[PDB]
Amino acid sequence: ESPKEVLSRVQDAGLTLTNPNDLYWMVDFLKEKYYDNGDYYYPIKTVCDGESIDVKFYCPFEPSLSPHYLELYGSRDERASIYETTMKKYNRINSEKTSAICTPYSSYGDTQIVAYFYSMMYYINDQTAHLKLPESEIESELIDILNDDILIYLNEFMSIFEPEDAQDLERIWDFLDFYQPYFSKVDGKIVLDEKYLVRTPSQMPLIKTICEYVSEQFAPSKNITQVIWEVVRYIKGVKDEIHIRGDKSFTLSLQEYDDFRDKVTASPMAHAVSDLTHERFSYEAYTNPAFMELENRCSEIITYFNDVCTSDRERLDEDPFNSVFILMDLDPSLNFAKSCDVVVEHAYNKMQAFLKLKEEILESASDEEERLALARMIKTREDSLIGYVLHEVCCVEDGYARDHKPLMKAFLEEEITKSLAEKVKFNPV
Ligand SMILES: CC(C)=CCC/C(C)=C/CN[C@@H](CCC(=O)O)C(=O)O
Ligand SMILES: [Mg+2]
């Protein structure tokens, strides 16, 4: 469409997330207003316990939205039929928007597979969130189901894992840790014992859809060990979260929170699959200690940004595992607004640490092939960082985001109206 008809729609109906075209104009506005002006501080306007949360998320990477977002959104009802879900829950997760904005330069299928991975994290997260309830409301049967589900989910990823190198089979086998006694190595594959296939988990169609795509698209020609490795790390992290949330003794320091969030942010799973979509790819990077730290900085930045945006909702859940609340518990002078400022500052320092690791990783490359591979893999993680910022910025319609921001809806509608008018006025120049 033209800026004139979009301006007419915004002046009359405002901005929506139900019309997928609006997101293209929102992301275009954010790039022109911020990135294109050298301003890498994106506004986040929300509330927490009645306190105004008015902060800036720092991210110096180029904003973009996938050209496939229109088709992804147009097929969202078919996609949702895979899930055991209400549409109310599916709409708030909005994996179509997450994948399109964090993975903007991929094919339709390579963008959709990222949506599937992020949706898997959200649905498992909301299943684990049952442990947030008071002790008198916990149902042990739901916890038994959850513990069985993630073990069965893990085996489904094991079932597509047939590495060319036996060293990669040992890498995953040694990484199973407390899950290893449930598995056996059988004909070059890691298999769950038949005793523990006791149910069909509620999101098994989703997990099978993920495994089928990875098996059919990447397993024949690429080394998918890191995809499996990150899934193991995530599933073990969910188990750690169950153990952490199960014991109502919440004793996580900020560093222990970082180490825990390194496992459960799920973006490393999406990066592992996205890495396989590019010819520039170095499997050795995954065991490079500097690259592993770069992935951890990325997960922590997303976590800290998420902690600010989820603060008011998680405060009502009495959920203590949020960097905003951990800092307040350690410092009594902090209210919610001042704590969010500290989290935002920590996120800025992690971003600078990310950029410092990036320069060191690329300088350590031994040849052009490895440099271009590392640079491509780092670029993929940068896409997710700016994508997640814009994801939270553009929560402008209630029901189509985990954390609707009515102050962002008002701010973006006021600002995009002036920007679209400037496009119309100088047209066709
Ligand atoms: C690009 C994406 C999608 C990154 C993952 C975002 C993230 C860090 C999710 C963690 N989930 C939160 C609560 C989110 C919610 O409930 O909406 C938690 O459990 O700490
Ligand atoms: Mg949280």
UniProtKB/Swiss-Prot annotation:
Pathway: Secondary metabolite biosynthesis. One of its GO terms (molecular function) is metal ion binding. Can also use Mn(2+) ions as cofactors with a lower efficiency. Keywords: Magnesium, Metal-binding, Transferase. It comes from the Eukaryota. Mg(2+) 1 binds at residues 306, 310, 314. SUPFAM superfamilies: Terpenoid synthases (SSF48576). Mg(2+) 2 binds at residues 314, 321. Changing residue 122 to F: Normal activity. Its cofactor is Mg(2+). It catalyses: (2E)-geranyl diphosphate + L-glutamate = N-geranyl-L-glutamate + diphosphate. Changing residue 98 to M: Acquired activity on dimethylallyl diphosphate (DMAPP), but reduced efficiency with geranyl diphosphate (GPP) as substrate. The keyword Transferase applies. One of its GO terms (biological process) is cellular response to carbon dioxide. Induction: Up-regulated under phosphate limitation and by increasing partial pressure of CO(2). The keyword Ribonucleoprotein does not apply. InterPro entries: Isoprenoid_synthase_dom_sf. It is an enzyme of class 2 (transferase). Belongs to the terpene synthase family. Magnesium-dependent glutamate N-prenyltransferase: part of the gene cluster that mediates the biosynthesis of domoic acid (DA) and derivatives, natural products with neurochemical activity acting as ionotropic glutamate receptor (iGluR) agonists, thus being neurotoxins causing amnesic shellfish poisoning (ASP). Catalyzes the conversion of L-glutamic acid (L-Glu) to N-geranyl-L-glutamic acid (NGG) in the presence of geranyl diphosphate (GPP). Also able to catalyze the formation of farnesyl-L-glutamate from farnesyl diphosphate (FPP). Cannot use dimethylallyl diphosphate (DMAPP) as substrate. This is Magnesium-dependent glutamate N-prenyltransferase. The lineage of its organism: Eukaryota, Sar, Stramenopiles, Ochrophyta, Bacillariophyta. The gene is dabA.
